[PDB]
Design a protein around this ligand. Structure first.
Ligand SMILES: OC[C@H]1O[C@H](O[C@H]2[C@H](O)[C@@H](O)[C@@H](O[C@H]3[C@H](O)[C@@H](O)[C@H](O)O[C@@H]3CO)O[C@@H]2CO)[C@H](O)[C@@H](O)[C@@H]1O
Ligand SMILES: OC[C@H]1O[C@H](O[C@H]2[C@H](O)[C@@H](O)[C@@H](O)O[C@@H]2CO)[C@H](O)[C@@H](O)[C@@H]1O
Ligand SMILES: OC[C@H]1O[C@H](O[C@H]2[C@H](O)[C@@H](O)[C@@H](O)O[C@@H]2CO)[C@H](O)[C@@H](O)[C@@H]1O
Ligand SMILES: OC[C@H]1O[C@H](O[C@H]2[C@H](O)[C@@H](O)[C@H](O)O[C@@H]2CO)[C@H](O)[C@@H](O)[C@@H]1O
Ligand SMILES: [Ca+2]
Ligand SMILES: [Ca+2]
Ligand SMILES: [Ca+2]
Length: 686
């Protein structure tokens, strides 16, 4: 099948995700609606269930609302069973309509539907070539009070009906009891509760195995992707072992939510996206888009910097899920704002790198402040809004023009209010011009592109006051006026002669797992696939066609490899780097080192005899480790994904910059558990 196929669970760069708050989209089955104080059919009280369910999504998939819009994927509220409690927060009732208060990860939320409903949703979506992404929040269960077990459902956790435990009398230690986080440090936000939500303890073997079994159930139901909740608040090491469990079983596109505020650029964020096994929601992108197109707190130079910067900071910038708003921000469109601002931001997102996500209702110009005002019931299913048409004309380009799905990004013209950028991939080009200035035209002269000579009609058909472009030889465009608020798109597509890799997924797995290599020019006959210097050809290449290769990871030593392919004739393609071959199945192990004194700015790291520990390379050591919550300085700890059942030798390092001080004596040694979790506690050897 082609890279653009709806059965491609490893690549969403050619797709356009429609984010659905299930309860606020469409009530297709009144029978499963909550009752009494937990419900409001007029959806006036935005904190109670309104009725939106899976049958409603099924209906909107079948009657063409999403299809006609160009949406090829949907991201829905967490499907697992939530608590039924109606929490009174300072006189205001609240329900689990949002689905973030899980109680049983192996059951569905009856308000959304039954298992069978979920199955029908998967079938209906797939029958219309629409992938399905589910929210999954393994960080916590639900609101709880340690010294007041009658509050809500005490954050109780069930395993397909069987009670595992609650927050009160947590003798099994299923949850954390370190208080609540103030978000002061990453460590503080990971091992303490988010608000009053019972924080699950992933170092507890029961919780670890439970969650991994849970996701498998959903993978077996046919989901095509996963949206991980508050990933900045779970041990990164455990999450990596979680992604390995997923990828070593049934890999699906996974992205986590790591909030970034205005102007925030986080190296940690980058590292997590580059090494965890999942990508992230592109907040850096979204926040900059808001500044530039919505709030007027930065200009195109800032947008350009974000694009060039993120392209350098993210190893797979193309896996980042972009958006202009969501359920935790005020709607992009302000009631008294010019609608063109939302339209331009939309056009920009749909033609930029990554995986665009559109918050339901955006195409209907929904306005609304912070939660819950941004979660109103969609007021209309009209296909006649300008925003709907914008998405309709641009979303399909991600499928037909690989330059938009996998292309590089280059600024070709710019000033305070104007940005004309170019996307390129093989014999494919797309040029996008945007003028954020709603009252001032822009005279564009000197624009140079990679577009072949000729005349190009605006793909938006002038919908956003775009214009026709005239390109001479050398790709130089002749002078033109870019209208106020003008937005235009010009493109060129043709067959690519040389093998070009535009995407690889998953990016982390053990030998034997099948990965997907997408792009153009691979040819119809099986060629060769390279993992570093290692050549793979023949039978281990399960299937091969011009835009997609399905190949099994060779039994090479664990490590980081460059992926490359060659066609039947032997012509090599570009290199897709940063692929991680695991050393085998993974288990999460907490490493603890005592009496490791340091000077300010100096931190302790972990290094060892397996790639998962950086194979003794200081620059690849795990850390910096923690020393605040679970253990206090001079004791340090860190949860790490390591190969199950392997005997591993390790040591700890004290690093400042790239300068490293090694533990003295002999290597520490231990054997990772075959499954479940583990903890190794040792002393620092001077
Ligand atoms: O590089 C692979 C090896 O990495 C580890 O070796 C560490 C030692 O653990 C560490 O003590 C340090 O050894 C130095 C030693 O302290 C000093 O007396 C001597 O003069 O120089 C040594 C360095 O050459 O640094 C090495 C890394 O170089 C790991 O313990 C080992 O098993 C790996 O084979
Ligand atoms: O002509 C090549 C040149 O094109 C663009 O430069 C623009 C510039 O961005 C505008 O602000 C204005 O000054 O017109 C210039 C073209 O005459 C590219 O930005 C630039 O890098 C490139 O060399
Ligand atoms: O907790 C984070 C913090 O840990 C280390 O700080 C130590 C410091 O090195 C010791 O000399 C002593 O002052 O205790 C501190 C922890 O309370 C890291 O050195 C520091 O960079 C890091 O932020
Ligand atoms: O009860 C606390 C809040 O829980 C949810 O908030 C979600 C948020 O929507 C999601 O994007 C983020 O990743 O996780 C948090 C907590 O799971 C509800 O949406 C809020 O209304 C609640 O106040
Ligand atoms: Ca319903
Ligand atoms: Ca947590
Ligand atoms: Ca890369």
């Amino acid at each position: 099948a082609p890279d653009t196929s709806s059965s491609n669970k490893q690549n969403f760069s050619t797709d356009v995700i429609y984010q659905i708050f299930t309860d606020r989209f469409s009530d297709g089955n009144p029978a499963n609606n909550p009752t009494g104080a937990a419900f409001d059919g007029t959806c006036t009280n935005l904190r109670l269930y309104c009725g939106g369910d899976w049958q409603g999504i099924i209906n909107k998939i079948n009657d063409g609302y999403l299809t006609g819009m160009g949406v090829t994927a949907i991201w829905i509220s967490q499907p697992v069973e939530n608590i039924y409690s109606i929490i009174n927060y300072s006189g205001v009732n609240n329900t689990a309509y949002h689905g973030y208060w899980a109680r049983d990860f192996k059951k569905t939320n009856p308000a959304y539907g039954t298992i069978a409903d979920f199955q029908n949703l998967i079938a209906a979506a797939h029958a219309k070539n629409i992938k399905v992404i589910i929210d999954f929040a393994p960080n916590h269960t639900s609101p709880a009070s340690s010294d007041q077990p009658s509050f809500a459902e005490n954050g109780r956790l069930y395993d397909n009906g069987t009670l595992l435990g609650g927050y009160t009398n947590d003798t099994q230690n299923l949850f954390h009891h370190n208080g609540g986080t103030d978000f002061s440090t990453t460590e503080n936000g990971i091992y303490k509760n988010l608000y009053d939500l019972a924080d699950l303890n992933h170092n507890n073997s029961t919780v670890d195995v439970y969650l991994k079994d849970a996701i498998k159930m959903w993978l077996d139901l046919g989901i095509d992707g996963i949206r991980m909740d508050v990933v900045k608040h779970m041990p990164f090491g455990w999450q990596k072992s979680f992604m390995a469990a997923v990828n070593n079983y049934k890999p699906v596109f996974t992205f986590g939510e790591w909030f970034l505020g205005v102007n925030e650029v986080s190296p940690e964020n980058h590292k997590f996206a580059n090494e965890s096994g999942m990508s992230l929601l592109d907040f850096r992108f979204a926040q900059k888009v808001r500044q530039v197109f919505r709030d007027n707190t930065d200009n195109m130079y800032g947008l350009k910097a974000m694009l060039e910067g993120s392209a350098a900071d993210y190893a797979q910038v193309d896996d980042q899920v972009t958006f202009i708003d969501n359920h935790d921000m005020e709607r992009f469109h302000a009631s008294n704002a010019n609608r063109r601002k939302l339209e331009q931001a939309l056009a920009f997102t749909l033609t930029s790198r990554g995986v665009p996500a559109i918050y339901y209702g955006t195409e209907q110009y929904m306005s609304g402040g912070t939660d819950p005002d941004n979660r109103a019931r969609i007021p209309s299913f009209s296909t006649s809004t300008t925003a709907y048409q914008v998405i309709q004309k641009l979303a399909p380009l991600r499928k037909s023009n690989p330059a938009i799905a996998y292309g590089s990004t280059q600024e070709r013209w710019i000033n305070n209010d104007v940005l004309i950028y170019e996307r390129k991939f093989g014999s494919n080009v797309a040029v996008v011009a945007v003028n954020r200035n709603l009252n001032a035209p822009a005279s564009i002269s000197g624009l140079v592109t990679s577009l072949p000579q000729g005349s190009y009609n605006d793909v938006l058909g002038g919908l956003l006051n775009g214009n026709t472009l005239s390109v001479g030889s050398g790709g130089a465009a002749s002078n033109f006026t870019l209208a106020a608020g003008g937005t235009a798109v010009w493109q060129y597509t043709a067959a690519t002669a040389t093998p070009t890799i535009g995407h690889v997924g998953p990016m982390m797995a053990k030998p034997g797992v099948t990965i997907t290599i997408d792009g153009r020019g691979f040819g119809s006959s099986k060629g060769t696939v390279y993992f570093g210097t290692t050549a793979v050809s023949g039978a281990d290449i399960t299937s091969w066609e011009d835009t997609q290769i399905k190949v099994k990871i060779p039994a090479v030593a664990g490590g980081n490899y460059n992926i490359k392919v060659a066609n039947a004739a032997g012509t090599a393609s570009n290199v897709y780097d940063n692929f991680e071959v695991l050393s085998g199945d993974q288990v999460s192990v907490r490493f603890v080192v005592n009496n490791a004194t340091t000077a300010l700015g100096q931190n302790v790291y972990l290094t060892g005899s397996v790639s998962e520990l950086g194979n003794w390379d200081p620059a690849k050591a795990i850390g910096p480790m923690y020393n605040q919550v679970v253990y206090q300085y001079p004791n340090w700890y860190y949860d790490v994904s390591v190969p199950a059942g392997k005997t591993i030798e390790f040591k700890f390092l004290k690093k400042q910059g790239s300068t490293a001080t090694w533990e003295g004596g002999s290597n520490h040694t231990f054997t990772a558990p075959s499954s479940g979790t583990g903890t190794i506690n040792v002393n620092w050897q001077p």
